[PDB]
Design a protein around this ligand. Structure first.
Ligand SMILES: Cc1cc2nc3c(=O)[nH]c(=O)nc-3n(C[C@H](O)[C@H](O)[C@H](O)COP(=O)(O)OP(=O)(O)OC[C@H]3O[C@@H](n4cnc5c(N)ncnc54)[C@H](O)[C@@H]3O)c2cc1C
Ligand SMILES: CC(C)C[C@@H](O)C(=O)O
Length: 456
């Protein structure tokens, strides 16, 4: 970047809020993925939406790529500056506004995390349910189309984003459903909100998200259930869903994952393929749900439920930190991930096959997953210097993605495409799907400067 351009950035946001220092750029050049750190040419922290718009307009008109940056917890290289440019760290805009408890809605800026929102909401009787394990930017979660353990009951980001404020690549300000609007449903025009959820910073910069809030459950029960086999745990999951038990959380850990979590959390669960379960209801609807869920797990060899405020928090903290538990197995490893999602009836086939394929290869791997959605992740731990191992693990991940596609599923349930799944996406939606997505990309970002090299 020229020094005139850098001074122009400083004129917008203030000198302390622009950095061209290599260390600062390198910290913003990677996420949690394997994709090589590619440092942006500068990092900029806008302090308000007007500044976001002016930074975007300056970059766009000068041919400088723009990389939106939330909390940098993505796992597909979304923030990697493959073509250089300006990384826009959005987290100084950290205000919660327009809290409408009577309407179950709130507006959050990119610096607001789920933990901050739910802390702000304690005593309200409301909470925000979509819970990635990282305390991520809520606007980043809208950008990636995130889900979480609670999504099986309470929906994904797509289900819970009511409106978005978006700075388009050339700086124009768009309120996807209209400025200030919030409602339960609409047929008014084309739904623009859904287009920007899961856009990963390639269509514009989300500067606020209007979120659906949910009533806190009357009563909560959590438990773990150990199984003799992966087949037994996943058959139980499918049968629980087919019986329409409205479980709040249903999470799978294979024996490898469970052992890693034990070692990283001082849980001490039996080392076995395991379901972490949570139920929400009145003290008596719970008794009904438990009754019927235990009957199904018992049919498949599940243990009697090991019951879990403080022990349940411990349970879900261990689950949320599964990524770090797996990385801690061999210190220094980074890791590759998968994220397939299949029709639920095909979930037993693909999980059992994945476990078998992990055994049959040199590969080390742990399995954890939002199986209530038909979704799971492989965590594939690698040496950052062993190029041969990385080639095998990438080949494994691509084969797993293609197997999910063969079953009618999707290559990513929640993490997104970034740099890692672009070729799988082309196979998933085919030539007319690819061209259609590209046409939408081109009308919003004619110059191709909005997070280039990602998704498409
Ligand atoms: C331990 C751990 C557990 C996780 N668990 C889950 C899980 O259960 N479910 C799940 O879905 N993900 C999960 N993730 C992945 C990650 O937390 C989510 O993808 C999250 O939504 C990323 O948010 P972020 O702000 O950190 O993203 P970043 O890495 O900062 O950015 C991700 C992508 O979105 C873009 N972007 C970010 N902010 C904006 C914005 N305001 N406007 C436009 N584009 C933007 C970036 O350009 C990039 O392409 C987990 C990650 C970790 C490390
Ligand atoms: C970090 C991801 C590979 C796993 C994450 O999505 C989770 O469900 O804990």
């Amino acid at each position: 970047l020229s020094q005139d351009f850098v001074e122009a950035l400083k004129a917008v946001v203030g000198s302390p809020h622009v950095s061209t220092a290599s260390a600062v750029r390198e910290q913003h050049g990677h996420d949690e993925s394997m994709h090589r750190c590619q440092p942006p040419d500068a990092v900029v922290w806008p302090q308000n939406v007007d500044q976001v718009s002016r930074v975007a307009s300056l970059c766009y008109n000068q041919g400088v790529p723009i990389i939106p940056f939330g909390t940098g917890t993505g796992v597909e290289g979304g923030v990697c500056a493959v073509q250089g440019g300006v990384c826009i760290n959005l987290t100084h805009m950290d205000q919660i506004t327009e809290l409408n408890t009577e309407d179950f809605s709130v507006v959050v800026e990119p610096g607001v995390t789920r933990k901050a929102l739910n802390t702000h909401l304690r005593d309200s009787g409301l909470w925000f349910p979509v819970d990635p394990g990282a305390d991520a930017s809520l606007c980043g979660m809208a950008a990636t189309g995130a889900s979480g353990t609670n999504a099986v009951r309470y929906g994904t980001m797509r289900d819970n984003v009511i409106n978005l404020e978006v700075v388009l690549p050339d700086g124009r300000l768009l309120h996807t459903a209209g400025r200030g609007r919030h409602y339960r449903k609409s047929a008014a025009g084309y739904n623009l909100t859904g287009l920007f959820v899961g856009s990963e910073g390639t269509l514009g910069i989300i500067t606020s998200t209007t979120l659906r809030l949910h009533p806190a459950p009357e009563a909560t029960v959590a438990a773990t259930c150990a199984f003799p086999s992966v087949q037994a745990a996943v058959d139980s999951t499918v049968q629980i869903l087919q019986a329409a038990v409205p479980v709040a959380r249903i999470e799978f850990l294979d024996d490898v994952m469970m052992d890693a979590c034990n070692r990283h959390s001082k849980l001490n669960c039996p080392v076995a393929p395991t379901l972490f379960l949570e139920f929400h209801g009145s003290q008596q609807t719970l008794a009904e749900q438990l009754q019927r869920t235990e009957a199904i797990t018992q049919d498949n060899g599940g243990s009697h439920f090991s019951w879990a405020a403080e022990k349940r928090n411990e349970l879900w903290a261990a689950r949320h930190n599964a990524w770090y538990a797996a990385l801690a197995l061999s210190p220094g490893s980074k890791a590759y991930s998968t994220d397939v999602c299949v029709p639920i009836s095909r979930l037993p086939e693909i999980l059992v096959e994945t476990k078998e394929e992990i055994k049959a290869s040199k590969l080390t791997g742990a399995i954890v997953g939002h199986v209530g959605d038909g979704n799971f992740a492989c965590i594939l731990l690698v040496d950052p210097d062993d190029a041969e191992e990385q080639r095998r693990v990438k080949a494994f991940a691509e084969n797993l993605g293609r197997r999910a596609l063969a079953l009618g599923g999707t290559c990513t349930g929640e993490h997104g495409i970034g740099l890692g799944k672009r070729q799988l996406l082309q196979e998933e939606v085919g030539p007319v799907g690819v061209e259609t997505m590209r046409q939408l990309k081109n009308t919003l970002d004619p110059r191709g400067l909005m997070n280039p090299g990602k998704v498409l």
